[PDB]
């Protein structure tokens, strides 16, 4: 083994996790031990990070990383939004599904 327990566990702001660098967006991964898909997230960037959803996982580069239809991700990342300014819709209730 070599990193056995990491020596600083915390995070400065995420409530923007858009700007981010390639280098951080990992690093937020395994802090939640999420190192799968620190390989795919490898060079991605807070915005591309939260950009990602259920779909994107259909196809590569996340890909059937987990056993979890990418649902642990998908939730770690939920939240990376629901700070950032997003409007989302409001209306409920698609036409075609």
């Given at each position: 083994?070599?990193?056995?327990?990491?020596?600083?566990?915390?995070?400065?702001?995420?409530?923007?996790?858009?700007?981010?660098?390639?280098?951080?967006?990992?690093?937020?991964?395994?802090?939640?031990?999420m190192?799968e898909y620190?390989?795919?997230?490898?060079?991605?960037?807070?915005?591309?990070?939260?950009?990602?959803?259920q779909?994107?996982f259909?196809?590569?580069?996340l890909?059937r990383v987990s056993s979890d239809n990418g649902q642990r991700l998908l939730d770690m990342?939920?939240?990376?939004?629901?700070?950032?300014?997003?409007?989302?819709?409001?209306?409920?209730?698609?036409?075609?599904?």
């Amino acid at each position: 083994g070599s990193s056995g327990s990491s020596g600083m566990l915390s995070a400065r702001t995420m409530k923007e996790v858009v700007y981010w660098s390639p280098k951080k967006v990992a690093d937020w991964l395994l802090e939640n031990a999420m190192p799968e898909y620190c390989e795919p997230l490898e060079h991605f960037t807070g915005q591309d990070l939260i950009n990602l959803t259920q779909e994107d996982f259909k196809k590569p580069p996340l890909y059937r990383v987990s056993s979890d239809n990418g649902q642990r991700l998908l939730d770690m990342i939920e939240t990376l939004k629901m700070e950032h300014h997003m409007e989302a819709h409001k209306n409920s209730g698609p036409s075609s599904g």
